[PDB]
Design a protein around this ligand. Structure first.
Ligand SMILES: *[C@@H]1O[C@H](CO)[C@@H](O)[C@H](O)[C@H]1NC(C)=O
Ligand SMILES: *[C@@H]1O[C@H](CO)[C@@H](O)[C@H](O)[C@H]1NC(C)=O
Ligand SMILES: *[C@@H]1O[C@H](CO)[C@@H](O)[C@H](O)[C@H]1NC(C)=O
Lengths: 284, 96, 240, 30, 48
């Protein structure tokens, strides 16, 4: 497999994410009623391990991360640099595993026994003859043997800009595995100019449900390499990836008292387990 | 004049009375919720149990529910009587 | 390594299964076999495997057997029906059949609705085998003895386990019934995708987001429903 | 009629109770 | 009882003991309320 060179090793940056990624626990709609559901949630004020995918010198890191029930991923992107995800147990192409692409068509998914390279990515180049970003090397995996599940999600569109700027947008996801079902939840937040996760309350809305038996110990993320004319011109050193940032927070079983608005949007939630105060609220 | 001001400024005057109102409301609410509890049965909703179970089996599960549900009702009626008696005393005192 | 298939998004008739009656055992838990069609369910699963007739009793809720406690254990709250039926002719070969295997030994009991895919030889206490497989150390696999000559009593049975969970999400695993046109503002009995309640049906002001399929009040009782074919939202109240 | 539990109307209405209370008060002063 | 019996067939005995014990509490809880009510009247008479 192809590699990449001159990476900087530093201790993981830490931040505190508070009251984020509360996801509608199930399908029911309720109006003006306070309900307590014992469903896995990111603990409030839980520790969050920030990550960097920004060259700003010779900095590029997207290594494997441990995965538990609470695989909450919250990337922040502008020119759409973080795209996909990898799930699985050992990524040996011998145990059934999950994998995605975030194309302008769909968040394309498969369950397949894929043989991933040591440094997978998405490649885009700026051509002088035509101003458009094309895939250069889609060698994310060698082949597939058995695929018990194949799948395409709902259509949507992506901007795919090749510029520099603050991350105007926000994307949150909660990956979860329960009772033989793989599930995902999402929200787009148009937060402005906050390095840390925004103070406030927003509720993730389930996007897709997939019935899968795959057991996955850990997961990885996909980056978009911003290949240009100034780069050396090879798969090992030719890249100017630039800025990117994503944060991962684990999920543990907790009881959330979730307030339901008249319409049904979960406007506010209090965590009973997180604080001594909080525990009183559940009993109350 | 002061009493008018005191009454408008706080719910404390009706706390002794209101506690009775709230306590009765809470008791009724619990029992109503009880309906949801399984009480050892396959499923909480009565109709659902009947729909998916053949009469002899349905017989047993129905009996279980009734025992669980009979007990729930008994607690409410027993609970209600004590409160009723307590309220009755106040009325006598109330009437007095 | 039992085979499991997930069946959903389709209409199944159980009459043929119940109706055909070509199967030796059709034990049913929490569901009336005759009443199967009327009830509607989501997330149905199918279990595939072959065990001998003697151990057929073992594959049931709250029972003990080597294979039940070491290979496949049914949950206590299971609400599924398991069907068994001999296929002696298929399991009789001149050469003989021995691709069917069951585990003998395992350090700890297998969890309910889980399969152990690990391939290893069970090890007991001291003198660890590390693939030695002599005395007191045993290989994981164990074959069968299905033979034509072999007696019926221990002859192979083909066993399928049907497991389903109901009233969680809108259910497409619904049965046979031909639907009917919706009736509004009149007290009438109604069933929606295996959910049964009776009350007045009226156009509902409440606006539902795409994911939601049910509405509820303070007492966690059905308050609103969406006719699947129509896409509309309506309020249910007791008639009188 | 909410779920088989019915709250019967009071035998005396709130307005009627007020008249009795008003009457006693009226009687006391006069 | 728990050590001797497994959960699967455990429930029948585990379930019942629970039912029987619940009865003890309800009788005691109900008894206390009647006793408390009597004391309250006495307290209020005594307060009077
Ligand atoms: C989060 O990790 C940081 C590491 O510097 C530590 O100081 C802090 O106490 C941790 N907080 C929690 C809640 O784990
Ligand atoms: C899941 O994969 C891990 C890999 O460490 C393994 O230890 C575990 O036995 C697997 N569990 C299941 C249920 O497949
Ligand atoms: C909630 O309903 C109100 C009705 O007045 C409406 O104004 C508002 O836009 C709705 N908001 C959402 C998020 O549905």
């Amino acid at each position: 497999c192809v590699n990449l060179t001159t990476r900087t090793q530093l201790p993981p940056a830490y931040t505190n994410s508070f009251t984020r990624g509360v996801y509608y626990p199930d399908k029911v709609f309720r109006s003006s009623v306070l309900h307590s559901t014992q469903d896995l949630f990111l603990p409030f004020f839980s520790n969050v391990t920030w990550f960097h995918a920004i060259h700003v010198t010779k900095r590029f890191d997207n290594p494997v991360l441990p995965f538990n029930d609470g695989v909450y991923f919250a990337s922040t992107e502008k020119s759409n640099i973080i795209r996909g995800w990898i799930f699985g147990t050992t990524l040996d192409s011998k145990t059934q595993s999950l994998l995605i692409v975030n194309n302008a068509t769909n968040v394309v998914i498969k369950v397949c026994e894929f043989q991933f390279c040591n440094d997978p990515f998405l490649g885009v180049y700026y051509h002088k003859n035509n101003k458009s970003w094309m895939e250069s090397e889609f060698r994310v995996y060698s082949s597939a043997n058995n695929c018990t599940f194949e799948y395409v999600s709902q259509p949507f569109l992506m901007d795919l800009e090749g510029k520099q700027g603050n991350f105007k947008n926000l994307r949150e996801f909660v990956f979860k595995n329960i009772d033989g079902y793989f599930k995902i939840y999402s929200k787009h937040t148009p937060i402005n100019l906050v390095r840390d996760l925004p103070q406030g309350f927003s509720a993730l809305e389930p996007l897709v449900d997939l019935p899968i038996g795959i057991n996955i110990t850990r997961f990885q993320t996909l980056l978009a390499l911003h290949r240009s004319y100034l780069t050396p011109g090879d798969s090992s050193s030719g890249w100017t990836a630039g800025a990117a940032a994503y944060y991962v927070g684990y999920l543990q079983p907790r009881t959330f008292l979730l307030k339901y608005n008249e319409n049904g949007t979960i406007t506010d939630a209090v965590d009973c387990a997180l604080d001594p105060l909080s525990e009183t609220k559940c009993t109350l | 004049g002061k009493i008018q001001d005191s009454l408008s400024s706080t719910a404390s005057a009706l706390g002794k009375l209101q506690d009775v109102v709230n306590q009765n409301a809470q008791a009724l609410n619990t029992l109503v919720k009880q309906l949801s509890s399984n009480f050892g049965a396959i499923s909480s909703v009565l109709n659902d149990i009947l729909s998916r179970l053949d009469p002899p089996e349905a017989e047993v599960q129905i009996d279980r529910l009734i025992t669980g549900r009979l007990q729930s009702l008994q607690t409410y009626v027993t609970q209600q009587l004590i409160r009723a008696a307590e309220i009755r005393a106040s009325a006598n005192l109330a009437a007095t | 390594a039992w085979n499991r298939k997930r069946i959903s998004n389709c209409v199944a008739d159980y009459s043929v299964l119940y109706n055909s009656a070509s199967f030796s055992t059709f034990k049913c838990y929490g569901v009336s076999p005759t009443k199967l069609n009327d009830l509607c369910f989501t997330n149905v699963y199918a279990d595939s495997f072959v065990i001998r007739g003697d151990e057929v009793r073992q594959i049931a809720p709250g029972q003990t057997g080597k294979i039940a406690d070491y290979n496949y254990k049914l949950p206590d709250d299971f609400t599924g029906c398991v069907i068994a039926w001999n296929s002696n002719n298929l399991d009789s070969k001149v050469g003989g059949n021995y691709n069917y295997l069951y585990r003998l030994f395992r350090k700890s009991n297998l969890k309910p609705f889980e399969r152990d895919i690990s391939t290893e030889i069970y090890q007991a206490g001291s003198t660890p085998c590390n693939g030695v497989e002599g005395f007191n150390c045993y290989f994981p696999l164990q074959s069968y003895g299905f033979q034509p000559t072999n007696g019926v009593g221990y002859q192979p049975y083909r066993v399928v386990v049907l497991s389903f969970e109901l009233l969680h999400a809108p259910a497409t695993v619904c049965g046979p019934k031909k639907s009917t046109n919706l009736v509004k503002n009149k007290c009438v009995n109604f069933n929606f995708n295996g959910l049964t309640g009776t009350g007045v049906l009226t156009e509902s002001n409440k606006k539902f987001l795409p994911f939601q399929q049910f509405g509820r009040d303070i007492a966690d009782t059905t308050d609103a429903v969406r006719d699947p074919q129509t896409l509309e939202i309506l309020d249910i109240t007791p008639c009188s | 009629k909410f779920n088989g539990l019915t709250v019967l109307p009071p035998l005396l209405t709130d307005e009627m109770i007020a008249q009795y209370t008003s009457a006693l008060l009226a009687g006391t002063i006069t």
